[PDB]
Amino acid sequence: GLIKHTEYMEFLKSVPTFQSLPEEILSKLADVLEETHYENGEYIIRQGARGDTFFIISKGTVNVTREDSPSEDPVFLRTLGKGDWFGEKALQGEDVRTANVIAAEAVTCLVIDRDSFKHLIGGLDDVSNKAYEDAEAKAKYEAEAAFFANLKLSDFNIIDTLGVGGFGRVELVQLKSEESKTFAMKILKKRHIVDTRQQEHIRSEKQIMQGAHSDFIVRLYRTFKDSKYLYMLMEACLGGELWTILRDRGSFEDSTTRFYTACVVEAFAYLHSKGIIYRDLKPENLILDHRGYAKLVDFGFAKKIGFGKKTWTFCGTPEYVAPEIILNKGHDISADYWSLGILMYELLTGSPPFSGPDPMKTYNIILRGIDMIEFPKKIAKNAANLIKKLCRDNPSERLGNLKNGVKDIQKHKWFEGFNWEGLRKGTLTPPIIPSVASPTDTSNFDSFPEDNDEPPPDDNSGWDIDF
């Protein structure tokens, strides 16, 4: 009873899932856990039964089967041993069982019912309850992956084209099996990737977007591949493209730009907190969802940088490249803060502050700096103030790369009256509200014809291995 608790505790510290949890949770768990015993061949659980109990194996092995029809043989799935657990769906509500768990020898479980677990979750506020939800969140993303891992391209159907370029195209795809589920599939010609030397830009794009979990960034759920293309299954943001909205409107009203800048500012708070530099900011990298909220799409130039490290790769559209990138000194996260001031200037006027007749001449007016620019009368004093602070030459002096970091940009006079929590909570009313009738409604995108041309060559070189 009192010494039982000391073994239950040392056993939970051996299980990889639980061992990392706080001792408050683990000792509280060791008090409530009841030890149940089974014999070889005994059904610990039966498919189709209703239950409220979760199991952890402390001794023995179990075989999990699942019969798919009365007049069909059973289907063996897996064998679970000591440290492994099952029945978990029973704790988070749903009590119906989907597979049989049979004892493959003498088995000993440590069992806990649904009530006993819910009653147990009452504990140390932002110490232990905080730490519990972090693991649950992390564990929710591995569950997500396995749902998508079972899928094939054959499980989707194409609705309409969302974008078409040299790369290939973006297509709205519907999950055949659940028609309410639609995604933005980005099909990419492997030849193009190869011809442009982008095998590593595309490998990182995958790694980052799948790793990212922000409401200001487009979700990349998984990837697919064939002999000719790469397929990136992403969340469908049906609000429309930001560059097609700016095109149609010319410029954006002061308060409209504030909302889209704020969305970017949160994306950058998230990305910079994980040591990732974005680089490719421009209106073609922002997409609104059905609500009218903007998300960062395209992580081609994005990079994972070491704490205290810089990069040297000269890249990006000339109009948006920072002085330290052109001058080939080092560049870091603060390069993204230069991009915010460019985006701002363009959204308010329809064009960026620096552009020449070729890349070289564009680079010559960029190194002259924001202080030489005669800001249009349409830019407000507060907006201009922020652009001049964001686009300073020395990256060390740049707003966002100071003491409070991103908070210094959130605290600017331009954001006086801006509900930053409303935006994060998702309760802030956006400036332009898209009309989206259903998941298949592509009415806020342009119409592109179907590709008539022949498919690109096959490429089985093996760089695509990870996809």
Ligand X SMILES: Cc1cc(C(=O)O)ccc1CN1CCC[C@H](O[C@H](CO)c2cc(Cl)cc(Cl)c2)[C@@H]1c1ccccc1
Residue 435 binds which entry of Cl ion, ligand X, none, CB below 5-8 Å type-dependent: none
The CA–CA distances, whole Å, from 142 to 217, 221, 407 equal 19, 11, 32
Q: Which residue is nearest to Cl ion (CB)?
A: 213
| Binding partner at 213 among ligand X, Cl ion, none, C-beta below 5 to 8 Å by kind | Cl ion
- Decide whether 83 or 300 has the Cβ nearer to ligand X: 83
Instruction: Give the separation between CA 323 and CA 368, rounded to whole angstroms.
Output: 9
What is the chain's Cα-based Rg?
27
From the candidates 126, 280, 289, 298, give the one annotated as an active-site residue: 280
Rounded to 10 degrees, the C-alpha dihedral 267/271/273/274 comes to: 150
Residue 136, interface with ligand X (CB under 6 A)?
yes
Contact 251, 347 (CB under 8 A): yes
Cβ atoms 222, 210 nearer than 8 A: yes
Determine whether the annotation assigns residue 301 to a binding site. no
Under 8 Å between Cβ of 272 and 405: yes
Distance from C-alpha of 220 to C-alpha of 240, rounded to nearest angstrom: 18
The verdict on whether residue 132 carries a ligand-binding annotation is: yes
d(CA 367, CA 391): 11
Q: Which region, judged by CB under 6 A, interacts with ligand X, from 37-45, 133-141, 164-172, 345-353?
A: 133-141
Distances (CA, A) of 339 to 259, 283, 300, 319, 442: 16, 11, 16, 10, 29
Q: Taking CB within 5 to 8 Å according to partner kind, which of ligand X, Cl ion, none is near residue 143?
A: ligand X
Residue 102 vs 234, nearer CB to Cl ion: 234
The 8-class DSSP code of residue 311 comes to B
Which one of the spans 85-93, 172-180, 249-257, 286-294 is the region binding ligand X (CB under 6 A)?
A: 85-93
Is residue 90 a known part of a binding site?
yes
Q: Catalytic: 280?
A: yes
Q: Judged by CB under 6 A, which of 17, 98, 313, 351 binds ligand X? A: 17
The reply to whether 168 sits in an annotated binding site is yes
Q: Is 89 annotated as a binding residue?
A: yes
The entry of Cl ion, ligand X, none near residue 64 (CB within 5 to 8 angstroms by kind) is none
**37, 78, 213, 381: which one binds Cl ion (CB under 5 A):** 213
Ligand-binding site membership of 162 (annotated): yes
Q: How many other C-beta atoms can be found within 10 angstroms of the C-beta atom of residue 237?
A: 24
Q: Which residues bind Cl ion (CB under 5 A)?
A: 213
Point out the residues that are catalytic: 280
Known binding-site residues equal 78, 87-90, 97-98, 132, 162-170, 186
Known binding-site residues for 3',5'-cyclic GMP equal 78, 87-90, 97-98, 132
